[PDB]
Amino acid sequence: ASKVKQDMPPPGGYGPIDYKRNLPRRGLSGYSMFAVGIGTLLFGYWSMMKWNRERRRLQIEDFEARIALMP
Amino acid sequence: PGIVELPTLEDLKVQEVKVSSSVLKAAAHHYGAQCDKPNKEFMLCRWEEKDPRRCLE
């Protein structure tokens, strides 16, 4: 005496189902990354130049200590 | 071919310097500043005679 009951889609329909590709760009420009790399290299070069000059001075100092002790 | 002449053990005696290498390294700069003259005389004798037996004094 009841209505016919069956597995049916809801009245109206279903919400949209996405199927198309989604691969967003999400990236910097090439110039930006190249510039960051070059700037990092230059900063490292300057730091290493200072440190190596100081190291050469220290080496000279301890070499002179050896020279003083040699006789 | 000849006899090698060597100084006697009494000749080789001296008041030794019994301080370690760290003490010497700590003092080295002032030591080379103050005791330059005998050290340089000894080194000149050494490099001109080419014989340790001629620069004991």
Side-chain angles (χ1 to χ4, degrees), chain A residues 1-24 27-71, chain B:
Chain A
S2 308
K3 223 150 219 181
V4 159
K5 185 91 232 313
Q6 222 183 359
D7 201 31
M8 280 311 254
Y14 282 118
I17 286 170
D18 279 14
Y19 61 93
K20 270 172 195 173
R21 193 194 255 180
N22 207 279
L23 305 178
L28 274 153
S29 200
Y31 315 123
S32 325
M33 308 180 288
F34 281 132
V36 174
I38 302 296
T40 309
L41 280 186
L42 298 179
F43 172 76
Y45 293 167
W46 184 84
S47 326
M48 256 332 275
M49 167 189 351
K50 265 153 37 132
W51 182 222
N52 272 344
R53 281 172 195 177
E54 169 67 18
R55 287 169 81 201
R56 293 306 291 266
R57 278 187 293 271
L58 298 153
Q59 184 204 222
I60 292 171
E61 176 192 18
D62 63 73
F63 279 14
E64 279 167 8
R66 170 179 184 261
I67 277 174
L69 286 188
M70 265 167 107
Chain B
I3 303 298
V4 185
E5 185 52 293
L6 308 111
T8 160
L9 294 178
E10 178 64 30
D11 194 327
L12 294 165
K13 312 207 175 186
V14 74
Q15 256 210 61
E16 285 171 10
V17 179
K18 319 184 279 313
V19 303
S20 283
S21 46
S22 326
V23 186
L24 284 177
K25 173 138 187 190
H29 277 249
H30 290 298
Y31 171 70
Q34 302 302 118
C35 316
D36 168 302
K37 196 200 125 273
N39 291 2
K40 293 300 181 165
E41 279 170 350
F42 173 69
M43 293 313 242
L44 180 80
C45 185
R46 215 45 196 71
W47 256 264
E48 276 176 348
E49 301 289 332
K50 312 163 182 282
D51 201 335
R53 296 170 309 197
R54 303 270 70 79
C55 309
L56 288 182
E57 306 310 300

